[PDB]
Paper text:
The structures of [name] crystal forms were solved by molecular replacement using a trimer of the determined structure as a template and refined using NCS-restraints at 2.7 and 1.9 Å resolution, respectively. The two different crystal forms belonging to the orthorhombic space group [name] both had four complete trimers in the asymmetric unit. When the structures of the fibre head monomer of the different crystal forms are superimposed, no significant differences in main chain conformations were observed. When trimers are superimposed, the r.m.s.d. is less than 0.5 Å, suggesting the orientation of the monomers in the trimer is also fixed.
Trimeric fibre proteins protrude from each of the twelve vertices. These fibre proteins have an amino-terminal virus-binding sequence, a central shaft domain, and a globular, carboxy-terminal fibre head domain involved in initial receptor-binding. The SnAdV-1 fibre head is the first Atadenovirus protein structure to be solved at atomic resolution. Despite the low sequence identity with other fibre heads, the topology of the beta-sandwich is identical to that of known adenovirus fibre head structures and contains ABCJ and GHID beta-sheets (the E- and F-strands in the long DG-loop of human adenoviruses 5 and 2 are absent). However, it is significantly more compact, making the 107-amino acid long SnAdV-1 fibre head the smallest adenoviral fibre head structure known.
Residue numbers in the entry:
A (entry chain D), C (entry chain E): 240 to 344
B (entry chain F): 239 to 344
The structure:
């Protein structure tokens, strides 16, 4: 483990998300994992400003965004100009927890 | 970091076995608590089994008082009441497989 | 953590998969986790030769195969004669990341 950021983000509708970013070295490979939790429900996209460390981490993904599975539906996390966006495929009465990762050489 | 790791096997009347692992981790200002669940068995109704006091204690700590958990074929809710662990499922599962549920807190 | 193998595997349609195998000891219990990532899409099964360490890890599962949930669908990983197979329930336009684990005494 060469990194562990955690932070809580909030929009003005009141929704809170906690994120954890983690980096791990495995010989030739690196793993980067995003962890997300919210107790809230969500109907539209979630937008909130992120710290520079998180924005930096989130930009590193090879696809420029993080496909993430929650118990009730699927989201895409991306960052743009220090604004974090989580878009969802369907409205979620509760978000819950999920993670998204990639492995790289 | 890791300030806790309980693991146990629980069993019901039919003979359905679940293994659980509870984990706590400290991340500066934040704590993460993760429940991991595995069963090779299929499940049609709810799974009820007695849990150790450490596990019951861990499971009760959740801000919603229950653990929403995704398995490969369906969704479950884990809760504890009076030292009885209950896993309720949205649909019957021919195989449970593995899943995790966590939360982050300040 | 008593083990961490990671490798990249590749098939004839251009699809690359990264796998990480992990073993952890927890007092009386062991946990074995497979992690899988691919940025590619996948229509049929994914077949690729694996290292001996990975074949060995994958054979250890009590069911002889790993049921694994990806954001858009479900897969079964198994190994036979050092050939890794990932079968899918539906075609996946993108595979993303997932893990599968078991606990044992």
């Amino acid at each position: 483990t060469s990194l562990d950021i955690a932070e809580e983000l909030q929009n003005d509708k009141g929704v809170s998300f906690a994120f954890q970013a983690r980096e791990e070295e495995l010989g030739a490979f690196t793993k980067r994992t995003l962890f997300a939790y919210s107790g809230d429900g969500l109907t539209g996209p979630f937008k909130a400003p992120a710290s520079a460390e998180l924005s930096s981490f989130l930009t590193a993904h090879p696809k420029g965004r993080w496909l993430i599975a929650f118990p009730l539906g699927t989201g895409i996390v991306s960052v743009d100009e220090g604004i974090l966006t989580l878009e969802i495929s369907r409205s979620l009465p509760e978000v819950g927890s999920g993670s998204s990762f990639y492995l790289t050489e």
